[PDB]
Amino acid sequence: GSSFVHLHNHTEYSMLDGAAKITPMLAEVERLGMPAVGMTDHGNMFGASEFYNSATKAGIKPIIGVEAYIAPGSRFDTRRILWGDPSQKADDVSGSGSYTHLTMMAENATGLRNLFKLSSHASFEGQLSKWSRMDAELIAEHAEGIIITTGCPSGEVQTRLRLGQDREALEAAAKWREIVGPDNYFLELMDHGLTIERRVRDGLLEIGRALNIPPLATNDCHYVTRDAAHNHEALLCVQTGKTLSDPNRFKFDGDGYYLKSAAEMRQIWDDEVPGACDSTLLIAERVQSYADVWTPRDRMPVFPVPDGHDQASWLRHEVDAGLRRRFPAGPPDGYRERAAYEIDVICSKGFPSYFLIVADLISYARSAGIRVGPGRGSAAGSLVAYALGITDIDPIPHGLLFERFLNPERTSMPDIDIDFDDRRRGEMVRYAADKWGHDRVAQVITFGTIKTKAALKDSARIHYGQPGFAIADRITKALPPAIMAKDIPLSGITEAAEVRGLIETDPDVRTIYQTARGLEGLIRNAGVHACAVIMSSEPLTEAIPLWKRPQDGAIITGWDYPACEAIGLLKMDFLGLRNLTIIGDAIDNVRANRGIDLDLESVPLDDKATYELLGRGDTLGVFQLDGGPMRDLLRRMQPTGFEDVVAVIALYRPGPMGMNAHNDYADRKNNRQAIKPIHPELEEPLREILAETYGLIVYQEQIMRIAQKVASYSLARADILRKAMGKKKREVLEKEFEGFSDGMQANGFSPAAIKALWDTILPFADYAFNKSHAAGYGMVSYWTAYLKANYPAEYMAGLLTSVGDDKDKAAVYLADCRKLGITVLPPDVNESGLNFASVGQDIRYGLGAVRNVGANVVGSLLQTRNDKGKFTDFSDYLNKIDISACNKKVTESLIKAGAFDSLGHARKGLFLVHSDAVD
Ligand SMILES: [Zn+2]
Ligand SMILES: [Zn+2]
Ligand SMILES: [Zn+2]
Known part of the structure; x- marks a missing residue:
């Protein structure tokens, strides 16, 4: 009744401008005992999800809006437009004729949704320089449920006033009032005792009286507290690139821009403009629950299937086809039944579309020559994944567990991700957007935090x-x-x-x-995430705010990926891996230099050469096995089979190392140490489960197998035990120990055996390794070692190519080349190509590996070297090339790199000859 709410307010998502973090803002809002608070960020609604959840969780009522940027003309108009004389630049349209402010708020969930897409459309369509702008026409199309005001000083109405244009101000105010409606327009009043605000105050209340607009007091808070003001001032400097000393910079006046108490606020307005503060409360109490917007909806794309199928039919059909391809002379024994079991869980949980989608992406990659990975994460324990090509690890020969991936007894979203040639993410993302809808696929924002x-x-x-x-x-x-x-x-x-x-x-x-x-x-700013992408069954503007990356036109989500999934959007990781690039290159090198055409998917896993190489620890540049101490361990271990590759990856981590598990594994494998049983009663029942890892527990899947054998657990319920022994919540550990112990009692184990096992597993489960992930990585390691061992020059060439023009990283591998007897020939205009090449038994330097030279230019050089070249002499090179200052900047670096020494002319010479040539 004599209380207050701030409606105009800037969060940290007013990037480089607002310094109010949401958590402290709510804290303050509460100890001032205020029932509600608003969020009015400049030009975006990126904080909305955070704000809503935080506010709700603290029983403060969120008012969610946006301080829009409004174009002086059409938002499509990118001309700059000014309303006064140059002598009035400081009072005129902000952004030098780019925009004005407008305070907008959502009265209910319809208005919120409308604000979301008004934001989105601002970026998609109304962008000038760094500002996303709405205009009156666009706002009118989506006005339902919104409350706007006459605005801050950088608003239209005040700008008009300041300019002397009283008719225009009054006319502006009537236009806006007409658009939202008499009951959703307020006369915004703000006092930080600045002379800019006083000038306009009379004109302003005139307009209020004339057009019958209630007054509204607000503070335009850019920070939480009054002491915070100085930090705010420094922040603006980061934004402007200016000095604190430098008086001419953009800054605020004094320190009034904090969240003032009802008291201080009423003190400014009650006597001066009756009703202003009360209107804040009228608005607050008018505002509805936004909760229909954050209610989870199943927004997963529906894979379009042929006519007369459904998702479940088509999945069976595709999984069948899959097995046929994979095992062309009949799938072995037990496969079909495993497949049917999985398909059954999958349909049951509602995920057949997801599988179909990821399959389809992988399918496209292959049709397009994009190298994909053998796959990572949990999905490698799914025969279905393998069937459809989502992975390339057959879960059966590696003993991976479907229920680790998709546990029939817990309801939860699996992570099924693609991963491919780093240089081709662009295509993959574009393909997704084409297949699923340009308005239904978006990359995910990241927030650049200082x-x-x-x-x-x-x-x-x-x-x-x-x-x-x-x-x-x-x-x-x-x-x-x-x-x-x-x-x-x-x-x-x-x-x-x-x-x-x-x-x-x-x-x-x-x-x-x-x-x-x-x-x-x-x-500091908004980035695009390295790999996450969001997809939906419906246009994404219907669910979340979004924006267009100005540089390429990419569509990016307004909130991060947990907020997105939180409301039932699908997220997938489109991961680009460089080792995959390096693999693809080494393979290409083998085609070119050896005429062999290698297909990794059919390399044996027992290649003597490879394990020999592993045994030496000559693993520089082999995926996941290059570390120093790693090399030591590999040497100590003398690996001999694929399972050893899978183990080192798991064992070379802080947990197992802390326990000496890696050395122990090594030693036991090579008869230098006896295999200790967990306990004597436990020896025989667990022997085969732990055999492959020389009696040590290394993987999550072993915790599961162990609980199933000894404690009579479901694999599903052993999964749940494993998750829980990982989290360590007393209440849950005890219920679960109860169960574990009872099961073992039932199976006849002493209290000593139970206590040994439990005591062993409990710490181990903090760090135990997902065996499916180790197989996927393991596969890539092995493949990578196989190439180095059997195709040294081809592989090292691929490796050096990936190190760009960085001399430091290169010197590491060049040293390796030298230690393997591979000769490295220098960059040369006649013999070098863009990347490093395998030439017989040698590596030939890449041209793009020198400073200032990129595919762009090297392309035209090789172009012309094919049509007419090779180059006979420096001047021949000039006559074969073309006139261009930029072409000269390149030529200079090639000379330095000694690209021309092949011709047999000193280089000091060539520089001089080059200058004339340009003149
Ligand atoms: Zn601001
Ligand atoms: Zn403003
Ligand atoms: Zn503001």
Whole structure:
């Protein structure tokens, strides 16, 4: 009654502009005892999911909206438009004639949905430079359920006022009021005692009176608290690229832009403009539950099947076909029944479409010559996955467990992902969009959060400018090295640090460190995730806000992938792997240099050569086996079969190493150590389950097999035990020990045997390794070793190609080449191609491997070298090439790289000759 709600408010998702993080904002909102809060971010609704959930979870009522950017003309119009005289630039259309602000809020779930797509359309259609803009025409099409206002000072109505254009201001206000309706338009009033706001206040209340618009007090909060104001000021500097000293920069006036208490707020408005604060409460109480928007709906695409099938029929049909291909002279024994079991679970859980989709993507990759992976994750324990080509690991010969993948007794979404040649993700993503709908497939946003290291570089540019680099560079070196891609949380220095001393010493560094903490974990920008993609049965604008990446036109989700899946959108990882690129290249090299045409999918898994190579530990550049201590272990282990490859991958991790499991495995395998039983009563019942791993427990699947044998568990229920012994919640451990123990009692085991097993498994289950993932990786390792062992030059060539023009990474493999007796010939205009090549027994340097040279240009060189070349001499090269300053920048680097020495002319010469040629 004498309370208040902030409706105009900027979150950290007003990137580089709002400094109010949602969690502290809610905290504050509550101790000020306020019933509700709004979210009004500049130009986007990326925080909506977070805000809604956080607000709801704290019983504050969320008001969700957006401070739209509105074009001065049509949103499609990319001309800049100004309404006053140049002498009034500072009062005129923001963004130099690009936009005005508009505060918009959702009264109910219809309005929310409408705001989502109004946002989306702003980006799809109304983009000028960095601003996504709506216009009046577009907003009118989607006005239902929305409340708008007359706006902040950067709004249209005030801009008009400030400009002297009273007629236009009043006319603007009537246009907007007409569009949303008399009951959803408010006269927005804001006071930070600035003279910009006072100038307009009278004109403004005139308009309110004239057109009959209620007043609304708001604060345009850009930070939570009053002390936070200084951090806000530094943030704006990161956004502007300007100095704190530099007075001319964009900044706010004093510190009024926090979440003021009902009291302070009523103190400003009650006497001055009766009703303003009360309207906030009228609005808050008017606002509905948004919950229909976050209610999960099954939005998984429906694979289109031939006529007279359904998803389940078609899956059977396809799985059958699959087995036929895979086992062309009849599938072996027990396969069909396994398949039928899986198909049955799958249909039962409602996932046949998903399988069909991933199959179809894999199908396309092959039709297009895109190398896919043998597959990763849980899916490798599914005979269906294997049948359909989703994986290439037959789960049966490797003893992988379907119920680890899809547990019939738990309801939950499996992860079925493609993974392929890193250089071809583009095509894969485009294909998906074509197949499933351009308005139904989107890549997923990531949020660029300000990290510790760039926080400091930022803090320095803020205090010092361009010359700030020195101090900046100075601070950053003092830093402990990473772990291994994660620099030390700043607050943390509140520790192996010398630098800490650096601050206690230098007063300037204390102030840079201070400013950087104010900056940490705010959001710098929006990225596109490396691999996640979201798909839907319905247009995605119906579910979530989205945006268009300006550079390529890519459509990206507004929320991250957990928020998306949280409401029943399908997410898949379209993963690009470079080892797959390297594999494809080595294979190509073998076609070219040896005329063999290798098909990895049919390489034996027992190749003597390979295991020999493994035994030496000459694994530089073989997938997952290159580490130093890895090489040691491989040597100590003398691997001999595929299962050993699968084990090292699992064993070369901190958990098993902590237990010495890897060395133990090695030693036991080579008769240097006896195989200890978990307990004597346990020896014979568990012997075969643990045999392959020389009596040690290495995989999740073994925990399951163990619980089934000894405790009479379902594989499904053993899966559930395994998950739980992983999480370690007392209440659940005890129910489960109850069960485990009872089962073992029933099977006749002493309390000692039960206690041994339990005690062994319990810590081991924190870290136990998913055997399906180890087989998938293992396959790639082995394949990779097989190529190095049997095709050294072809493979090393592929490897070096992947290292780009980086001399440092290259020097690592060149050293390897040398240690294997492979000769490395230099870059050459007549003999080098774009990438490194296998030439007989040699590697020939890649042309693109030199500085300043890329496929783009090398392409035309090889082009012309085919039509007319080889080049006879430097001037012949010039006569065969073309006139261009850019062409000259290239030519220079090729000379340096000695690409021309083949011709037999000193290079100092050629530089001089090149300059004339250009003139
Ligand atoms: Zn702002
Ligand atoms: Zn504004
Ligand atoms: Zn604002």
